Design a protein around this ligand. Sequence first.
Ligand SMILES: *[C@@H]1O[C@H](CO)[C@@H](O[C@@H]2O[C@H](CO)[C@@H](O[C@@H]3O[C@H](CO[C@H]4O[C@H](CO)[C@@H](O)[C@H](O)[C@@H]4O)[C@@H](O)[C@H](O[C@H]4O[C@H](CO)[C@@H](O)[C@H](O)[C@@H]4O)[C@@H]3O)[C@H](O)[C@H]2NC(C)=O)[C@H](O)[C@H]1NC(C)=O
Ligand SMILES: *[C@@H]1O[C@H](CO)[C@@H](O[C@@H]2O[C@H](CO)[C@@H](O[C@@H]3O[C@H](CO[C@H]4O[C@H](CO)[C@@H](O)[C@H](O)[C@@H]4O)[C@@H](O)[C@H](O[C@H]4O[C@H](CO)[C@@H](O)[C@H](O)[C@@H]4O)[C@@H]3O)[C@H](O)[C@H]2NC(C)=O)[C@H](O)[C@H]1NC(C)=O
Ligand SMILES: *[C@@H]1O[C@H](CO)[C@@H](O[C@@H]2O[C@H](CO)[C@@H](O[C@@H]3O[C@H](CO[C@H]4O[C@H](CO)[C@@H](O)[C@H](O)[C@@H]4O)[C@@H](O)[C@H](O[C@H]4O[C@H](CO)[C@@H](O)[C@H](O)[C@@H]4O)[C@@H]3O)[C@H](O)[C@H]2NC(C)=O)[C@H](O)[C@H]1NC(C)=O
Ligand SMILES: CC(=O)N[C@H]1[C@H]([C@H](O)[C@H](O)CO)O[C@@](O[C@@H]2[C@@H](O)[C@H](O)O[C@H](CO)[C@@H]2O)(C(=O)O)C[C@@H]1O
Ligand SMILES: CC(=O)N[C@H]1[C@H]([C@H](O)[C@H](O)CO)O[C@@](O[C@@H]2[C@@H](O)[C@H](O)O[C@H](CO)[C@@H]2O)(C(=O)O)C[C@@H]1O
Ligand SMILES: CC(=O)N[C@H]1[C@H]([C@H](O)[C@H](O)CO)O[C@@](O[C@@H]2[C@@H](O)[C@H](O)O[C@H](CO)[C@@H]2O)(C(=O)O)C[C@@H]1O
Ligand SMILES: *[C@@H]1O[C@H](CO)[C@@H](O[C@@H]2O[C@H](CO)[C@@H](O)[C@H](O)[C@H]2NC(C)=O)[C@H](O)[C@H]1NC(C)=O
Ligand SMILES: *[C@@H]1O[C@H](CO)[C@@H](O[C@@H]2O[C@H](CO)[C@@H](O)[C@H](O)[C@H]2NC(C)=O)[C@H](O)[C@H]1NC(C)=O
Ligand SMILES: *[C@@H]1O[C@H](CO)[C@@H](O[C@@H]2O[C@H](CO)[C@@H](O)[C@H](O)[C@H]2NC(C)=O)[C@H](O)[C@H]1NC(C)=O
Ligand SMILES: *[C@@H]1O[C@H](CO)[C@@H](O)[C@H](O)[C@H]1NC(C)=O
Ligand SMILES: *[C@@H]1O[C@H](CO)[C@@H](O)[C@H](O)[C@H]1NC(C)=O
Ligand SMILES: *[C@@H]1O[C@H](CO)[C@@H](O)[C@H](O)[C@H]1NC(C)=O
Lengths: 482, 482, 484
Amino acid sequence: TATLCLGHHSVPNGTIVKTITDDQIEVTNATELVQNSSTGKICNNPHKVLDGRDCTLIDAMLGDPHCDVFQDEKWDLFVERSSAFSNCYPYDVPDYASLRSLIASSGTLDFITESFTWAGVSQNGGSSACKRGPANGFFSRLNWLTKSGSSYPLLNVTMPNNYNFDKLYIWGVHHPSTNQEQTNLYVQASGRVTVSTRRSQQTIVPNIGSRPWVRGQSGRISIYWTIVKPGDVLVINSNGNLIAPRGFFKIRTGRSSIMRSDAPIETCISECITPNGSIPNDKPFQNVNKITYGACPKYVKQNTLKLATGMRNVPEIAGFIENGWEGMIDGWYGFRHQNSEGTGQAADLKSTQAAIDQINGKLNRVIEKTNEKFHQIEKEFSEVEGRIQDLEKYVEDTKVDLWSYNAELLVALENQHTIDLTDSEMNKLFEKTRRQLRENAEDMGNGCFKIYHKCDNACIESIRNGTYDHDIYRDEALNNRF
Amino acid sequence: TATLCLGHHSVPNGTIVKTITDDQIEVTNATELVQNSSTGKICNNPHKVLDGRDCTLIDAMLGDPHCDVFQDEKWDLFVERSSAFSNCYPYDVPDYASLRSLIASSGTLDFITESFTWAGVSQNGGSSACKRGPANGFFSRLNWLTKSGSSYPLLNVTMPNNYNFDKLYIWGVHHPSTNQEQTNLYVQASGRVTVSTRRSQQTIVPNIGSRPWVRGQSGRISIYWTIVKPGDVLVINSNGNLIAPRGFFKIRTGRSSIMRSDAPIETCISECITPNGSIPNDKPFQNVNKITYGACPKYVKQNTLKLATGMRNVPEIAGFIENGWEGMIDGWYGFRHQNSEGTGQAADLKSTQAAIDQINGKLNRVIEKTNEKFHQIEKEFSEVEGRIQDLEKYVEDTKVDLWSYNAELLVALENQHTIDLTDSEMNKLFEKTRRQLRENAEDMGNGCFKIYHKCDNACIESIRNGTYDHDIYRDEALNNRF
Amino acid sequence: TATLCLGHHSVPNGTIVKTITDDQIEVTNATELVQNSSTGKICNNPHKVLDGRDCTLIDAMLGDPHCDVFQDEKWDLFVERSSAFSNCYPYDVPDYASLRSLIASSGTLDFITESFTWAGVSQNGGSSACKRGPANGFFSRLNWLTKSGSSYPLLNVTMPNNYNFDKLYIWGVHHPSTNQEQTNLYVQASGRVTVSTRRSQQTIVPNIGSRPWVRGQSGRISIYWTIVKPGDVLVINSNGNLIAPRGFFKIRTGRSSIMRSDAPIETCISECITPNGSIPNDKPFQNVNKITYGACPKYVKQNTLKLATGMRNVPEKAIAGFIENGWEGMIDGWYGFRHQNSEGTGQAADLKSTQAAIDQINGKLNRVIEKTNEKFHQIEKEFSEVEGRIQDLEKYVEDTKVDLWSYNAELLVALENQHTIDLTDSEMNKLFEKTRRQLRENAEDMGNGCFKIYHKCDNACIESIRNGTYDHDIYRDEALNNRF
Ligand SMILES: *[C@@H]1O[C@H](CO)[C@@H](O[C@@H]2O[C@H](CO)[C@@H](O[C@@H]3O[C@H](CO[C@H]4O[C@H](CO)[C@@H](O)[C@H](O)[C@@H]4O)[C@@H](O)[C@H](O[C@H]4O[C@H](CO)[C@@H](O)[C@H](O)[C@@H]4O)[C@@H]3O)[C@H](O)[C@H]2NC(C)=O)[C@H](O)[C@H]1NC(C)=O
Ligand SMILES: *[C@@H]1O[C@H](CO)[C@@H](O[C@@H]2O[C@H](CO)[C@@H](O[C@@H]3O[C@H](CO[C@H]4O[C@H](CO)[C@@H](O)[C@H](O)[C@@H]4O)[C@@H](O)[C@H](O[C@H]4O[C@H](CO)[C@@H](O)[C@H](O)[C@@H]4O)[C@@H]3O)[C@H](O)[C@H]2NC(C)=O)[C@H](O)[C@H]1NC(C)=O
Ligand SMILES: *[C@@H]1O[C@H](CO)[C@@H](O[C@@H]2O[C@H](CO)[C@@H](O[C@@H]3O[C@H](CO[C@H]4O[C@H](CO)[C@@H](O)[C@H](O)[C@@H]4O)[C@@H](O)[C@H](O[C@H]4O[C@H](CO)[C@@H](O)[C@H](O)[C@@H]4O)[C@@H]3O)[C@H](O)[C@H]2NC(C)=O)[C@H](O)[C@H]1NC(C)=O
Ligand SMILES: CC(=O)N[C@H]1[C@H]([C@H](O)[C@H](O)CO)O[C@@](O[C@@H]2[C@@H](O)[C@H](O)O[C@H](CO)[C@@H]2O)(C(=O)O)C[C@@H]1O
Ligand SMILES: CC(=O)N[C@H]1[C@H]([C@H](O)[C@H](O)CO)O[C@@](O[C@@H]2[C@@H](O)[C@H](O)O[C@H](CO)[C@@H]2O)(C(=O)O)C[C@@H]1O
Ligand SMILES: CC(=O)N[C@H]1[C@H]([C@H](O)[C@H](O)CO)O[C@@](O[C@@H]2[C@@H](O)[C@H](O)O[C@H](CO)[C@@H]2O)(C(=O)O)C[C@@H]1O
Ligand SMILES: *[C@@H]1O[C@H](CO)[C@@H](O[C@@H]2O[C@H](CO)[C@@H](O)[C@H](O)[C@H]2NC(C)=O)[C@H](O)[C@H]1NC(C)=O
Ligand SMILES: *[C@@H]1O[C@H](CO)[C@@H](O[C@@H]2O[C@H](CO)[C@@H](O)[C@H](O)[C@H]2NC(C)=O)[C@H](O)[C@H]1NC(C)=O
Ligand SMILES: *[C@@H]1O[C@H](CO)[C@@H](O[C@@H]2O[C@H](CO)[C@@H](O)[C@H](O)[C@H]2NC(C)=O)[C@H](O)[C@H]1NC(C)=O
Ligand SMILES: *[C@@H]1O[C@H](CO)[C@@H](O)[C@H](O)[C@H]1NC(C)=O
Ligand SMILES: *[C@@H]1O[C@H](CO)[C@@H](O)[C@H](O)[C@H]1NC(C)=O
Ligand SMILES: *[C@@H]1O[C@H](CO)[C@@H](O)[C@H](O)[C@H]1NC(C)=O
């Protein structure tokens, strides 16, 4: 007689995962699917990262003197720091967020000076709240007009767009603190500013009243913008309180954006940037921050998700029935034989290769490699606003919940199918071996066959290869069994 | 000889479910996953529910006399009734929804009086449209200023924030019906109101014109609000038409919200509130209302979803092949034996336990227990508005469709796997029994084994336990079978 | 002895699909789930499609002369062309998109004229920028008021809503180019327009200043609207610069909408319309356009998704069984028997297992996904100008929805293919095991899916085995001598 047993490998330290059917099952190998940490640094490649330091994007656009270093800059990602401050004439922007988003998306601050003529007024007004060295100054891209002599005439100027790209104009209106100041700077008791194209118009009447002192001044300035398409024309008509433009900004379509962060910038390479720093993108999910730029993993709420990579781990001649082989390091499935010569062991390459090829590349079949997103909505707020902020928060929360559910279900399903396939492979190998031994062998019921004839080492090798001929040993076996 | 059959339990009345593969299959037990009814009452525990009977939140905030009972109230959920009405001076709020949302989210009406000084004007103006008993009155939190003698001087007042929390100020502007009324109440022919901090400013010019009578009055009032951060200062500068504040409201961050409902409030306990009433949250899905507050099931479009909790139900010695055992009430899987002593029956505990432990707790592996949401967007509207309302409706519709698809797919998948696992358990038990009987038994092909030796009750019990020794009965069987 | 083999059909040209476990597996039949093409025409049935031609919806509402043919029209879908233009007095609409969406959703332009009284002013002002034939004209639904003699008195007019439906009023304000023009047309140096109900009010002060010439004019007009509920009243109070309404529009609730397209309209039937044209809706997914109207498939990013309809396709390499071998010579069913005997070889098919497999395969996708979701009026999804916050939010919402539905479609196809392959394999194995059960001890398995029967099993014996009425005892003893 002889013994031929079939078995599968096991490891001393396994990992616990979750399936559709079982909450905890131990397997021989697993991988983590959620990225949960960052180095805390922002890499300067391959995206062009521009550090704003102590300047906001709007202050750099307007021409705050301590931001003069930012003239005509370009970026892929503009990083705004929390220590930024303003040091010029106090101002406000109706719909600040929209202008900020527009400028950030455009990705450039290229400015072209134009030859405006302002007949009968003084130009280049200044203030002690915006100092350029020792002298009083103002925003570098704006022109503060006041009366000349004792008159402030009606201004009526035009500028056509004879290029083939769009023009962006930034202009403003001054709000004085008293009626006496209004008459002192602009002769008329009530100013008016009108800015129009062939398809749009805006008219502003200034507001008068005392306000809290900011850098010594109780007056204010309001900022507005206008876009002029190719073939159109801009007309400015005003009888007081005009803060004139000095030229226009180019506006482009691209993949630029802006981000708030305090992380330092270092020399390295990374495709995914968050406010916490750069993160690697080899995993499909991340838990670091829902604000991202570049090729990034999808944000989820879970901090860990384990995907099974090997078969179930069963502690440890016998077969595979509730028994694993801790002494096998040559493969996943294999044979053992007990004989007159002695015990021997070998592995099955075909079933191991089939299992590995099935397991490898599993998650790429369902989920995409990397989703690249560049400019998105704001997801953190500093002031309370109401309806629109509520809607933005609701949208983000809904998206996060749905993607977290997707990730959980996908991991559970994949683990279930991996376990099932490994078990089926083992059973198929056992059944094929049973098919080869037609009537000369019997199943012991523990995954092990007993062969009734003399099966030496060459006999076992013939069985393992698949060239076993039962007829040769048929009659003898029929004598041993009955 | 003897007969040993394997079988599974059956029930007289089963339930229909749907799987991935079959449109309808009958099982022995199932559970409903969608909650589709409410008692029609709102429970007063554990959330603090405040009923605004005849008052809206805005009217209670401003100080409508018939809302005077609501001064300095707090809530977790404010319930607005459809029979609420206004009984004071006619008014309107630019961006009513935003102020309503922010007050509701704050969750309190705590008001602190401040000592404003208004020099040269008369205070506490009233109207017959807002009666406090027999006398003419006004909103309790606002101060109506008019001329004193024959003059209305320029008002210029300031108030600093020396606390460590934010302040909310409510103020207003009066719109008269005629120019004569304008000059009669405020000496100047055109009023103006300016309210500012160091970081913001608002200026309002009143509108003059006749309007439809409301409680005898053709004039109107417009309401505005301002938030003052710690370390900032509020400045009010007015030439006329000012409705002054009397103090400030505390504004907080929390989980409070507001709801429109007509359901009565009763003494009970429930964690999930809808406009239809309170609902239990033991099920993962609900169909009652997409407006919810608290720990609630997810809203879906389906009114019923059945999850299988038992094996397939097959109508009814024989085995398990296309035959169930209605006479088995001691377990799920079991043995029957036919012998010289007589027929006998028993149940298998291990396979039953494995099946039950697999079935129990299946849905908790994929879906979360309860998602708590407190303040969300509005989902029902009474007027047509356009762009923003279209966006809100679109967002809600997208969310509902995606979650309904998720629920349908999850139920189908879980039912498929439950059926598969029960079938596999039965087959495994049969194969194990076949393994134990090595050569002394024959498979009848109906799920039954024919034993060709004398197998008495003790022999049956040895087979069932797993201690059956074939060698003892080997030779005799070989004589009987051949 | 005799031979009995079990096998399954195969085809000379199979199709590749993807499952959860395999990147590529070849099956005998598959179907495409994504619609990726259109005929380029919009069908005029069953929806009512109205071609705007050279007019926008707002211009047709206001009464632009070259749009006069659109008076009192109705639609289910309004189609705006890219060659539309305006040919009247220059104007602008604050919140243009909201008014456009409201009118498009209402679905009608039914107008009722009312008898307003404007005492002390002249009516029916016109311009050379808006010509009706040879004469100067104006919008047909608006009345341009102007001074009479040397005075422009204060106007207070009222109109009550005594019906049981809502009223929509469109009105406007004129912005002159100079102060002299302001005093010439309206005596007062600063005009004012107030429009109010019991629950709302709006007041407009006109703006003065020079603007670029549009059809000879530097002045402008601004357009506003007001809704009056049943039992309410409208009051108009003005002392200059008013563009008065002539009546009211009916406003309805329904499923009407508007779409931008240049596709021509033809006589045909189709339930789903896109800017590219009509598309059939027999498939659950589409890749043509994310803008749709009617009963339409869900938009996804993938251009193809193949769902398996048959079993795995195995080529055909002494008859053999189903083990790594298919039967190209079988055209009568999916699973079948073959027998080798003294009379000769014979073949037959199994009807029960084939029927079970087909009934499982048929109608699988309808169990999970709904047939058709009908959507009528939605948000805008393409923009011509940069705006900022709201446009960013709309684009973000649409992108999120598209990504989630694409993931759903991919996962569903993979899961369904996996289960189809599993069910076909299980059916074949079950048939083989049943056949093994019938031959209790009278036959031996060769291990290639084929049994060999030790006794004399003729054609009638084969048929008895196939039917399920084979009795082993009859041939028991004889086989027990052949085997041992
Ligand atoms: C309408 O109401 C507003 C608000 O109340 C008034 O605005 C105030 O106007 C006064 C006068 O212009 C302002 O007073 C000035 O404040 C400056 C800043 O003060 C800060 O810094 C100093 C020292 O750094 C601190 O001590 C102080 O507490 C503040 O923290 C001062 O620097 C100015 O000093 C000038 O006057 C002093 C007088 O002794 C001279 O010695 C100095 O050399 C210098 O000339 C000055 O005191 C006040 O800040 C404004 N308030 C606000 C909130 O901005 C309007 O004036 C009022 N309008 C009318 C018509 O009444
Ligand atoms: C600008 O245009 C508007 C719109 O027409 C005009 O506003 C109207 O002004 C008049 C005069 O002030 C208002 O008339 C008053 O209406 C009150 C409410 O009437 C309702 O209730 C009564 C009884 O409950 C009903 O019979 C009636 O049909 C209404 O349902 C009346 O109570 C007032 O009564 C006073 O006058 C009568 C006259 O006999 C006396 O007997 C009374 O004691 C009392 O003194 C009064 O009739 C009218 O309501 C306003 N209309 C609207 C829509 O509000 C402006 O006049 C106009 N501007 C100018 C400058 O002309
Ligand atoms: C404030 O600033 C604005 C902006 O500059 C000024 O607006 C301009 O006003 C002038 C005067 O009315 C306008 O001039 C007129 O332009 C018409 C259109 O010109 C177009 O078409 C012609 C031929 O088709 C082209 O050659 C031309 O380049 C344009 O493409 C002309 O048709 C008018 O012609 C009149 O004058 C000629 C003079 O020879 C006569 O022969 C004609 O019969 C006719 O009477 C006229 O030239 C100009 O278009 C306005 N510009 C814009 C951009 O709108 C304001 O005038 C200014 N306000 C003040 C107070 O200064
Ligand atoms: C262009 C111009 O007029 N610049 C002035 C400026 C403005 O007049 C003012 O900011 C408009 O609100 O004001 C400057 O300052 C003045 C002080 O020097 C003076 O003591 O008080 C004035 C207020 O009553 C005013 O603040 C400034 O901003 O530096 C002077 C500058 O030339
Ligand atoms: C604080 C004050 O002036 N209160 C007045 C009030 C206002 O003057 C008015 O609401 C401003 O629009 O008006 C009161 O009523 C008046 C009537 O008594 C009078 O017959 O007609 C007036 C209109 O021309 C006005 O309606 C009121 O609202 O009760 C009187 C109150 O003292
Ligand atoms: C109802 C009316 O007053 N219609 C005028 C119209 C308006 O006065 C004007 O559009 C208001 O801005 O203007 C018309 O044209 C005028 C020219 O004929 C004239 O040479 O120059 C005027 C400007 O100073 C004005 O453009 C028009 O629009 O056709 C004449 C019409 O009767
Ligand atoms: C990445 O940075 C964010 C900053 O927003 C961290 O999130 C905050 O974490 C603190 C500490 O737990 C909380 O108090 C805040 O409420 C969090 N903010 C938000 C918006 O969630 C986050 O923990 C950081 N992640 C890593 C891995 O460093
Ligand atoms: C819960 O209350 C809502 C009220 O919004 C009910 O929904 C309405 O039901 C009526 C009657 O079928 C319809 O005419 C309305 O169109 C429904 N409104 C909406 C917004 O869908 C709902 O039926 C109630 N549910 C239960 C279980 O009582
Ligand atoms: C249906 O029409 C849309 C029009 O938007 C086509 O999408 C455009 O295709 C062109 C050509 O590749 C691109 O340059 C544009 O960027 C696309 N626009 C958008 C918004 O995606 C689309 O290809 C058409 N589909 C069919 C099947 O004809
Ligand atoms: C576990 O699987 C990963 C593949 O994801 C492989 O890189 C790793 O070497 C495996 N671990 C062991 C111990 O084989
Ligand atoms: C059906 O299953 C539920 C558990 O989901 C259990 O409470 C109930 O008793 C079962 N019904 C029967 C008849 O066993
Ligand atoms: C493939 O399946 C479709 C239905 O899914 C059927 O119409 C078609 O005839 C099938 N092809 C063949 C060759 O049977």
